[PDB]
Amino acid sequence: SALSYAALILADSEIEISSEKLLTLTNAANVPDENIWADIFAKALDGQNLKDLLVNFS
Amino acid sequence: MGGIREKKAEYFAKLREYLEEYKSLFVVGVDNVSSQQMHEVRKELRGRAVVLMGKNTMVRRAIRGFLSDLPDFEKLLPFVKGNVGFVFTNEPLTEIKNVIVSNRVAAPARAGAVAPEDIWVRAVNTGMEPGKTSFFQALGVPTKIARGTIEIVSDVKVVDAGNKVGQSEASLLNLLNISPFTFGLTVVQVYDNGQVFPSSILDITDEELVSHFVSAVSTIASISLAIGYPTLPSVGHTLINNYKDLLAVAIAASYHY
Amino acid sequence: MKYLAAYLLLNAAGNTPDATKIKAILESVGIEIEDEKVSSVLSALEGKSVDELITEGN
Amino acid sequence: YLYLRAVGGEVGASAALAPKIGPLGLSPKKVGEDIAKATKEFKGIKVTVQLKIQNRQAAASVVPSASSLVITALKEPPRDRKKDKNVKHSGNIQLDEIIEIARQMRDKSFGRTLASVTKEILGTAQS
RNA sequence: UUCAUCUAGACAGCCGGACGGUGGCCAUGGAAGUCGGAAUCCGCUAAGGAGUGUGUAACAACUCACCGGCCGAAUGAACUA
Hints:
- Chain D: One of its GO terms (biological process) is translation.
- The structure is cut from a larger assembly and holds chains A (58 residues), B (257 residues), C (58 residues) and D (127 residues).
- Chain A has 58 residues and is mainly α.
- Helix content of chain A is 66%, strand content 0%.
- The longest helix of chain C has 12 residues, at 2-13.
- Chain C has 58 residues and is mainly α.
- Chain C contains four helices and no strands.
- Chains B and C meet through helix 4 and helix 8 of B and helix 1, helix 3 and helix 4 of C.
- Chain D binds one RNA strand of 81 nucleotides through strand 1, strand 2 and helix 5.
């Protein structure tokens, strides 16, 4: 997903996963901003260990 | 053959326009490669875009640079080595290496050359009649006469990578008919667009990126499954997590329903 | 990594190259791109079906 | 390779075939047949034929060749009687004739381009 | 002193490379790089001469030309006193 890929790149670069930072990467890609989808995404990512989730999975 | 140029400043002048005509400029090593092999290798390049001349007349990339705005001086340490050419091309950097570096032709090693890789000689009958077996023994190849033929006792490494091959060593190997290396235009270097690439880059991984891609793909996939964020790939798994976890509470416990 | 996520994100949108997008996304991240890393990823990408590589997951 | 000399149409000469050894790796008049069949028209100037030997086979590297190709096209057997100026016989090859000789040569020749190949044959033709 | 070669890198030495038009007409027992005797273009092109010497009856290799590097600053040939 463009939104999931944007989150993993933002964490790899060392920058926080928020609405501004996702919006700038999303705009550079050329994909239109949709308020609901990045807002859910930041909310889903809230309270998470990105590192611990990333590795297990079937 | 006579004294007449044998040009100076004239062939440089043709060469001047040649770096400027083409985007991508390579610094390349013929030394090893035979010329049916080089000349064939060059046939490939030539259809696509072409190679031209120098000594120190080559090192004069500076004049070419001076005409434009690109390098001087500024380059890391001018990488040129014995036996260098320039390849001027349309062809992007990465592809040029795969043509040249992958497709090399074979040929024999040489006396006084540094071995590029480990050299071994096999055990079995040489097929040769009694004579100076001693020459083989001198190198540290054990041989003995079995069945009236010279045979090599065992497989062993005669020379390692990064050590020079002795003059005796080379000659004796050639008589055995043992060769083995890959020859073609070793790439020392690349210029494109203000950027300098050395040879480590130029062997261009790629399998590692597949693994990293698939792992990146799994990071995304993982994030997707666990997170619950339902565009096309993730969805059926995300629903399953909310069960995986219920079905699950049953297994440890000891209420039966 | 930065590079991997950036081309993946673009692939989801459906399009990519050196200056136009790869450079644009990482620059949108606010990070300075190493050219050698972009060049290596692109050279590797040529003649590859990204969708097929994804279909086995590893 | 270990090389040899030949005349058009020759077989079985004592001096040329016997001491140089009979290819086929034995049994001359194997090769003596093979060279002779191939040789073409009247003897003229000697050609190289070049010997390569394999297990119970002989093979020869024979180029009279691209110039013998010129002879066929022109319908003129000699070569340039009065060198580089003007020939005694009037063998002017056409431009269409020379590119077709170049087409056929292009495998044997290295040449990059067909236009490159036309120079190489033309340079041979003039002299 | 006179003529040539040198920072576009000479020079002493050491190191290193060579595919293709194609083994070229005359004559002769026989020249085919190299006994005698022609023209001399070109590919591609770091570069790869229809060839410098060493050969066999004749053919039969290997080097050199031409070209590249390690070093860095002058250089050698002719005459004259």
